[PDB]
């Protein structure tokens, strides 16, 4: 039946985008995969289908690595404000960079 | 003639740090390796032996990379103001991140 195509991992990372009310959002990722991510929304209304451009932020030691992304909201949990998102139009460099982060995180 | 321990490449990258004049420096790299980098000095005096804490920045596509690093000036060509620098005590995670980015 339905199958998650990419493993989802809880590696430390942040999402930054401009949402409703032209308010910026800076939130901790609940999980991350080659296909998308999840985070906890912040008060401002958000609904499945909403589309945003933003930056994925990764920091370890004195490395900071950033990824500009387009994502569409695919689920919003009213109780927890959990928002689940799908990347749209990921460039091959981006895809590969994501997989590097995720492969390294898996197995240490 | 010496064999360079790390291979050097010419890619779009910049170095930022606070110089001797206490004013900011923001310069394009001449080249980069996992061991260090070079750039042309334009402002304040700078000499071999100087230590700085800086930020190495790279950006291609939607990808942006940044490494906070201590570096030591190894050489300065007084004529061209070419500065050659060596990274100080990088973590293996950081060297590996450099060797990755370079390999391209
Ligand atoms: N990946 C995923 N998709 C979801 C989920 N909830 C709804 N869907 C999607 O909506 C279809 C119907 O979901 P369902 O009503 O729970 O109806 C499901 C459900 O009754 C059952 N089922 C499928 N996988 C599982 C499972 O892992 N555990 C249990 N207890 N039942 C499952 O088979 C039916 C058909 O499933 P699918 O053909 O895959 O088609 C599913 C799926 O495409 C979810 O939690 N995870
Ligand atoms: N890291 C992360 N990515 C997210 C999240 N929400 C959406 N995405 C990404 O967006 C893809 C499409 O989401 P979908 O349309 O809801 O289409 C989904 C959805 O219908 C279903 N599904 C998968 N996992 C679940 C689940 O846990 N609960 C429910 N109800 N459905 C699920 O399976 C389809 C395909 O799943 P994927 O192949 O993984 O493909 C997902 C995933 O790459 C999230 O919370 N975290
Ligand atoms: N439309 C959509 N919604 C998503 C997606 N991913 C997560 N969600 C929503 O976020 C809820 C929590 O996701 P979870 O923590 O991964 O917690 C999930 C997860 O651990 C598990 N699960 C459900 N489907 C799958 C699957 O297809 N593959 C795997 N590995 N786990 C699944 O079941 C738990 C509860 O799933 P849900 O009741 O459906 O509750 C999910 C769902 O409402 C997605 O891809 N598409
Ligand atoms: N001044 C200097 N430059 C270095 C040194 N090591 C590498 N290079 C530079 O790297 C280029 C390619 O080096 P190579 O692969 O060894 O490729 C070189 C190498 O195979 C060979 N070669 C040139 N000089 C020598 C030498 O003195 N001893 C040996 N065994 N081979 C040499 O000729 C190839 C083309 O030489 P180039 O046109 O000059 O282009 C050289 C040269 O610009 C060095 O130790 N000193
Ligand atoms: N103190 C110090 N100064 C450095 C260093 N690397 C570069 N420089 C200085 O900046 C010039 C190098 O520019 P290049 O593009 O690598 O172009 C270089 C380079 O391609 C080649 N080459 C010369 N020596 C070597 C070597 O020992 N090993 C290798 N692999 N190539 C060399 O010949 C060109 C001219 O080399 P130079 O006449 O020496 O002129 C050099 C030198 O004055 C360093 O590691 N330490
Ligand atoms: N990307 C880049 N990194 C730099 C530069 N200058 C210094 N570094 C980094 O700092 C290390 C020590 O530089 P060095 O003391 O001048 O000690 C140098 C230097 O004495 C010699 N050397 C290598 N290439 C050249 C050259 O082209 N010209 C001259 N005159 N000497 C060179 O080989 C030694 C070791 O060089 P490396 O193994 O590569 O190891 C170098 C390198 O990792 C630069 O201009 N560009
Ligand atoms: Zn299923
Ligand atoms: Zn030669």
């Amino acid at each position: 039946g339905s199958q998650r195509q990419f493993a989802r991992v809880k590696l430390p990372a942040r999402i930054r985008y401009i949402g409703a009310n032209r308010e910026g959002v800076d939130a901790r990722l609940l999980d991350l995969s080659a296909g998308g991510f999840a985070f906890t929304a912040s008060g401002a209304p958000i609904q499945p289908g909403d589309l945003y451009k933003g930056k994925l932020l990764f920091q370890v030691d004195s490395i900071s690595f950033s990824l500009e992304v387009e994502f569409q909201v695919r689920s919003v949990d009213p109780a927890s404000r959990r928002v689940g998102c799908e990347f749209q139009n990921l460039k091959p460099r981006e895809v590969a960079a994501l997989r590097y982060l995720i492969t390294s995180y898996l197995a240490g």
Side-chain angles (χ1 to χ4, degrees), chain A:
Chain A
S2 159
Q3 185 172 4
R4 287 183 181 179
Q5 183 181 1
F6 312 108
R8 309 189 176 178
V9 300
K10 295 196 287 187
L11 55 71
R14 295 228 138 220
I15 179 64
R16 289 196 77 212
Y17 70 99
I18 311 296
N21 288 121
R22 193 72 183 186
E23 295 168 4
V25 196
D26 184 325
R28 171 96 163 74
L29 292 198
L30 297 170
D31 63 46
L32 165 66
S33 73
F37 61 95
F39 69 96
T40 310
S42 57
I46 180 169
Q47 290 175 358
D50 287 349
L51 182 99
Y52 308 94
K53 266 75 163 182
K55 214 86 174 284
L56 286 186
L57 308 165
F58 309 85
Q59 290 169 326
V60 128
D61 294 302
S62 293
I63 310 166
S64 304
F65 162 64
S66 233
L67 177 46
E68 194 174 23
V69 297
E70 195 167 8
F71 63 94
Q72 190 169 29
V73 175
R74 289 313 185 191
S75 69
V76 182
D77 185 296
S80 55
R81 305 294 273 147
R82 181 194 193 283
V83 178
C85 304
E86 175 178 16
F87 295 128
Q88 303 285 31
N89 303 308
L90 275 188
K91 299 136 218 150
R93 278 300 304 268
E94 314 176 297
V95 188
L98 272 179
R99 276 259 151 260
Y100 174 64
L101 281 155
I102 296 181
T103 296
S104 91
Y105 179 83
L106 296 166

